[PDB]
Structure 1
Amino acid sequence: HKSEIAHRFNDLGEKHFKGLVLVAFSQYLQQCPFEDHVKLVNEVTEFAKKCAADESAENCDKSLHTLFGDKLCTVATLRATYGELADCCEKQEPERNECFLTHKDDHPNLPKLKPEPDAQCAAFQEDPDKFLGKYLYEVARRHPYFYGPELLFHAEEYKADFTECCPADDKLACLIPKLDALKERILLSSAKERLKCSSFQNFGERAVKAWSVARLSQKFPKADFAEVSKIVTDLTKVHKECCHGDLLECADDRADLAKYICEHQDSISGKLKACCDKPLLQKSHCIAEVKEDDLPSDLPALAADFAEDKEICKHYKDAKDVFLGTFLYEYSRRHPDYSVSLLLRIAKTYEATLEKCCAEADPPACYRTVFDQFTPLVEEPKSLVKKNCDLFEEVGEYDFQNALIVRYTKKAPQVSTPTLVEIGRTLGKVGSRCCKLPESERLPCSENHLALALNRLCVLHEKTPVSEKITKCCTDSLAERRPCFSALELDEGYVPKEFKAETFTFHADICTLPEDEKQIKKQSALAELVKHKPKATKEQLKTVLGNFSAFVAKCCGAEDKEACFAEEGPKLVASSQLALA
């Protein structure tokens, strides 16, 4: 286009344009205040309007990365606050943008955002545009790979909560359960999209395509191969652009894809009808989270073409990607009861069987039993989901999380206590989400969400690497991640952590904390116990943590809380060392 910025301005409209630009700037430089960003946004928008008037004007010819990057480099106190990004500003495009992306920050470690119901309603009423603008800023700078359009969607849910609850009788009780519900949903979108960006970064575009072929085929089993090809291609392009900070390009293609899917919903899925009767952002989001379609009656038998056919080696050798693509498509349609990564593991085994069999003297007799190689791949995760859900049903979320914190601290004791506690808690929430579902949905839910949690762990590991075992699981294979982490056991080389009694010391401040924040503190001690006594059994550790919980309960219920913690605390810390031998 003659002017790219004018094009995107005209298409998306001013409101979305300004939103997406705000988000973009908030993601790249997370430390600058909100009012500085507002000024950058306004300056870029004014330029787009000026360009939209006369597209042949000076500088309107420039690309989006040129104009956006130029703008980023004008920021006050750039070299001081972001030395790393200021190094990029000397470079030209496309080198500069690639430098910007390289030096983004997954753990900015900003202050936690408390929902302050009284004061936020006041700020909402006085200036809603500023208030909702601030929400975009605050979420974007804490989640640097969030997809712009999807954040704009969740901003409308946020606004809708504050219109409903601020005029109402009780401000907190209306708003708090809605805001925590919106948090959960926002965190899930973020986790999914970060996995897609992580898949590009670590494994490449081919990996994103294959994941997407598997998932879309499951969701849209009645869509023909060429239809799924079209959608995955466009979707992969959306992902690539949103992950590489091309937010205006991302919003446009994402909107076109939603439009396309809804134009052709009769040849894609019958579950899209309600999603397609919605406004722009609502529609895109609904499609992305649409339930799987019912299995077609006429799904083909696969043994003939993929196991029994006599010229598979020739067909495979002619074009591997097309042949395996076709296999993955067909096998994924008929298996909505498998996880995405299981399907990719099965495809990898299919490939491996043909690589082996087609080198042997009589290939067809070798590859005749190829589908039977899948049996042990299917039963391994089916057992672990049944085992863990049985455990979760028996003991509940808190004890299940503790079981996993012990499990993972033994695997990787070099990881920081906060990270181990975070990952064990997140992994435990998969039990509460998935084990309650119908049993045919348990496996996919579980493994699909474990992947999100493990990718979080892997991203944290890129920042602060501590363990070669984690690096191998994170970097070797996307499909093998969850099995790789499961296969890890206690490393027999790890030196048990130096005993500091201060680590296991509690005080009366714990008593006034919320129940979640109490658990976290106990769970942190649990991790530290494992670090000091790595060979202690899970039953020993559970028993000792029970003694910690009882101690905290009695002293928080005492007349003189601090005298109780001081007297009873050292006794418990000393005896607990002996109980963990």
Structure 2
Amino acid sequence: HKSEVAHRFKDLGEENFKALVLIAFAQYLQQCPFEDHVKLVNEVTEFAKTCVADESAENCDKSLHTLFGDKLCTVATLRETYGEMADCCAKQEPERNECFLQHKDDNPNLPRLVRPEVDVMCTAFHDNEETFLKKYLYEIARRHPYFYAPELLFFAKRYKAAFTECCQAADKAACLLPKLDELRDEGKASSAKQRLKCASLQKFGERAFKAWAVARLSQRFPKAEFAEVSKLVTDLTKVHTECCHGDLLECADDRADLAKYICENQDSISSKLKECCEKPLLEKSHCIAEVENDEMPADLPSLAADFVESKDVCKNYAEAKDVFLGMFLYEYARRHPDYSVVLLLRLAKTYETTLEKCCAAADPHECYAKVFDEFKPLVEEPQNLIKQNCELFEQLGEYKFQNALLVRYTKKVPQVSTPTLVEVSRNLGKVGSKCCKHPEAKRMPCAEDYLSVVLNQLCVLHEKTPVSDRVTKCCTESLVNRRPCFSALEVDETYVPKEFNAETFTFHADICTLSEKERQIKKQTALVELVKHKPKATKEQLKAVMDDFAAFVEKCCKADDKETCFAEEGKKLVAASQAALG
């Protein structure tokens, strides 16, 4: 186009345009105050409108990169506030845009964003809706400078809807606060999956990524022919490679190009895309990324004919090994939207190892005729774990399910900090509540997605304060083996019990007036410390103490002098437990 800035304004609309411009400037200029950014936005928006009136007007034919970088270099405090970043302005394009990209700070050392009180939030929302939401858009964007800007805007719009509904409710906090909690976790999770995709691309390479994509696209689009899936894998690997590099415009163009291709070829891909493909450009690729799986074709034959029984298996494999393995994966995956992606990848690795071994024998057909037998236990291991865990969950409920997990994992890796053990155990209990309520055919993909978030959060905490070689092994393995590795951890036989600390087991009356969440965390913290100190305690012995503890808190919180109960009765509880455990 003649004026790229005009074309974006016409397509996005003024409101969306202004929000994305704010996000982009805040992700580059993460230390500038909100008011400086509003000013930049308004100046960009009035310039764009001149181009919309006349694509021939001055500087309207410049590229978006040129115009955006020129504008960053007009910021008066650029050297004073960002130092080295200001040297990027001495560069010509495209060197200049690359230089700005390298100086984004993914950990900018800003204070934590505090969630104010419900009445305070709703009153600001009422008083000035636009400034309220845009100031938070700025606060979030500047702390997460690689988060894809359109998706940030998608969250903002759901926040607007939560405040609009809940600030009119009779019980405002009961309406609003679980919505805020859901949006925060979903947002944190989306950021985790973006960073994990990019890190895994770098370490394990393009082929491993393409394998994942084949499985993932074949479950989503089971009616597509392999050649169409395989072209989609190629395009999607380009999109993720460019987006991981971090330039917003290039990432957005690649995503938009792929969505347009999909929507122009729906008959070859899926019957579920009509609604997404009617949406504006801004929303299209995100919508497609979240489409439900297509219904699979009926009466698909077994894989045995093409992959086990054919006389030609080794010949077809040897002439194009990755293509044949891709076809096996495509056929296996389109048939099993109830499997995790990593499960499908385990099966393809197993099939590959067998063909490597068996196509070297004089009778390969005899050698690999049983290969589908090897898949059965790989498939069953995660199915059985889900059954067991969801059963335990319905029998205990989330809290006591969390506690069962807390004791198990403390004993396996008692060197982990107590905060992390509590947090990871709680989040794992949340996975059970979320995914156990799905029918069986959707439980494994649910578990894979949310476990990938929780286990990454663990590996991230641990990578920075490492304490256990066995965790570091599970966190550095292939992502295909990550969960089985964690599932294979055993009780630490060589741990030296932690030395008793009286204060760790001293409880005060503030526990009666704490939040339910903080009371839970308080008790789960002490349960972890209890297992760290007496790791060889039986479940019977632990339950006895947990029951003594429960009577101890309920009694003292109803007693006239509470402070004295907790200290005197408390001393009794400790002395008795110390005798009943070891």
Is this a same-fold pair by TM over 0.5?
yes
SS at match of 1:436: coil
Q: How many angstroms apart in 2 are the aligned matches of 1:395 and 1:304?
A: 46
Q: How many angstroms apart in 2 are the aligned matches of 1:381 and 1:440?
A: 12
The 1:237–1:517 alpha-carbon spacing in structure 2 relative to 1, beyond 3 Å, is: farther
Match of 2:305 in 1: 304
The 1:313–1:177 alpha-carbon spacing in structure 2 relative to 1, beyond 3 Å, is: same
* Bigger mean CA offset, 108-117 vs 67-76: 67-76
Residue 446 of structure 2 is aligned to residue 445 of structure 1: yes
Match of 1:424 in 2: 425
Match of 1:536 in 2: 537
| Cα deviation digits, residues 501-533 of structure 1 (max 9, x gap) | 222222222322221221112112222222223
Q: How many angstroms apart in 2 are the aligned matches of 1:64 and 1:348?
A: 46
1:306-321 matches, cutoff 5 A? 306-321=307-322
Equivalent of 1:104 in 77, 101, 106: 106
**TM-score, normalized by length of structure 2?**
0.85
Deviation at 1:425, TM superposition (A): 1.0
Letter in 1 for 2:218: S
Deviation at 1:125, TM superposition (A): 3.5
The 1:349–1:20 alpha-carbon spacing in structure 2 relative to 1, beyond 3 Å, is: farther
Does the aligned pair in 1 maintain the 2:201–2:209 contact within 8 Å? Answer: yes
Letter in 2 for 1:525: A
Does the aligned pair in 2 maintain the 1:505–1:569 contact within 8 Å? Answer: yes
Larger RCO, structure (CA 8 Å, separation 6 or more) = 1
SS at match of 1:292: coil
Deviation at 1:94, TM superposition (A): 8.2
Deviation at 1:155, TM superposition (A): 0.9
Letter in 1 for 2:148: Y
Residue 372 of structure 2 is aligned to residue 371 of structure 1: yes
| Cα deviation digits, residues 212-235 of structure 1 (max 9, x gap) | 221221122112223222333333
The 1:360–1:192 alpha-carbon spacing in structure 2 relative to 1, beyond 3 Å, is: same
Q: How many angstroms apart in 2 are the aligned matches of 1:125 and 1:240?
A: 42
Letter in 1 for 2:19: G
The 1:421–1:122 alpha-carbon spacing in structure 2 relative to 1, beyond 3 Å, is: same
* Bigger mean CA offset, 89-98 vs 193-202: 89-98
Residue 494 of structure 2 is aligned to residue 490 of structure 1: no
Match of 2:78 in 1: 74
Letter in 1 for 2:520: Q
Does the aligned pair in 2 maintain the 1:241–1:247 contact within 8 Å? Answer: no
Match of 1:324 in 2: 325
Does the aligned pair in 2 maintain the 1:434–1:442 contact within 8 Å? Answer: yes
Match of 2:268 in 1: 267
Does the aligned pair in 2 maintain the 1:490–1:534 contact within 8 Å? Answer: no
* Bigger mean CA offset, 497-506 vs 167-176: 167-176
Q: How many residues align?
A: 575
Deviation at 1:259, TM superposition (A): 3.9
Deviation at 1:474, TM superposition (A): 1.4
* Bigger mean CA offset, 472-481 vs 35-44: 35-44
Does the aligned pair in 2 maintain the 1:341–1:448 contact within 8 Å? Answer: no
Match of 2:345 in 1: 344
Q: How many angstroms apart in 1 are the aligned matches of 2:207 and 2:67?
A: 27
Letter in 2 for 1:105: N
Q: How many angstroms apart in 1 are the aligned matches of 2:433 and 2:518?
A: 19
Q: How many angstroms apart in 1 are the aligned matches of 2:536 and 2:58?
A: 73
Residue 19 of structure 2 is aligned to residue 19 of structure 1: yes
**TM-score, normalized by length of structure 1?**
0.86
Residue 510 of structure 2 is aligned to residue 506 of structure 1: no
1:194-209 matches, cutoff 5 A? 194-209=195-210
The 1:72–1:6 alpha-carbon spacing in structure 2 relative to 1, beyond 3 Å, is: farther
Q: How many angstroms apart in 2 are the aligned matches of 1:58 and 1:360?
A: 64
Match of 2:390 in 1: 389
SS at match of 1:374: helix
Q: How many angstroms apart in 2 are the aligned matches of 1:448 and 1:60?
A: 36
Match of 1:405 in 2: 406
Deviation at 1:333, TM superposition (A): 0.3
| Cα deviation digits, residues 482-518 of structure 1 (max 9, x gap) | 1000111133343333332222222222322221221
1:144-163 matches, cutoff 5 A? 146-163=147-164
Q: How many angstroms apart in 1 are the aligned matches of 2:275 and 2:485?
A: 40
* Bigger mean CA offset, 497-506 vs 33-42: 33-42
The 1:27–1:533 alpha-carbon spacing in structure 2 relative to 1, beyond 3 Å, is: farther
Structure number with greater Rg is 2
1:55-66 matches, cutoff 5 A? 55=59, 62=66
The unaligned stretches of length 5 or more in structure 2 are none
Letter in 2 for 1:445: C
Letter in 1 for 2:235: D
Letter in 2 for 1:548: F
1:150-189 matches, cutoff 5 A? 150-166=151-167, 171-189=172-190
Q: How many angstroms apart in 2 are the aligned matches of 1:433 and 1:132?
A: 29
Deviation at 1:27, TM superposition (A): 5.3
Q: How many angstroms apart in 1 are the aligned matches of 2:414 and 2:262?
A: 47
Deviation at 1:262, TM superposition (A): 3.5
Q: How many angstroms apart in 2 are the aligned matches of 1:382 and 1:445?
A: 12
Residue 523 of structure 2 is aligned to residue 519 of structure 1: no
* Bigger mean CA offset, 59-68 vs 187-196: 59-68
Letter in 1 for 2:437: K
Does the aligned pair in 1 maintain the 2:210–2:234 contact within 8 Å? Answer: yes
Letter in 1 for 2:481: E
Letter in 1 for 2:250: E
| Cα deviation digits, residues 317-363 of structure 1 (max 9, x gap) | 33222221221111100011211111111111111111222233432
* Bigger mean CA offset, 393-402 vs 406-415: 406-415
Does the aligned pair in 1 maintain the 2:101–2:246 contact within 8 Å? Answer: no
| Cα deviation digits, residues 67-121 of structure 1 (max 9, x gap) | 8799799275446xxx9x89999997687567547x6239x68435325333333
Q: How many angstroms apart in 1 are the aligned matches of 2:145 and 2:511?
A: 33
SS at match of 1:408: helix
Does the aligned pair in 2 maintain the 1:4–1:61 contact within 8 Å? Answer: no
Does the aligned pair in 2 maintain the 1:357–1:366 contact within 8 Å? Answer: yes
Deviation at 1:312, TM superposition (A): 2.8
Q: How many angstroms apart in 2 are the aligned matches of 1:507 and 1:86?
A: 54
Q: How many angstroms apart in 2 are the aligned matches of 1:48 and 1:201?
A: 38
The 1:380–1:129 alpha-carbon spacing in structure 2 relative to 1, beyond 3 Å, is: same
| Cα deviation digits, residues 257-292 of structure 1 (max 9, x gap) | 344434433332333344445455555444333322
Q: How many angstroms apart in 2 are the aligned matches of 1:574 and 1:69?
A: 68
The 1:111–1:56 alpha-carbon spacing in structure 2 relative to 1, beyond 3 Å, is: closer
Does the aligned pair in 1 maintain the 2:88–2:96 contact within 8 Å? Answer: no
Deviation at 1:578, TM superposition (A): 3.5
The 1:240–1:73 alpha-carbon spacing in structure 2 relative to 1, beyond 3 Å, is: farther
Letter in 1 for 2:531: V
Does the aligned pair in 1 maintain the 2:224–2:268 contact within 8 Å? Answer: yes
Cα RMSD (Å): 3.7
Match of 1:119 in 2: 120
Q: How many angstroms apart in 2 are the aligned matches of 1:486 and 1:69?
A: 52
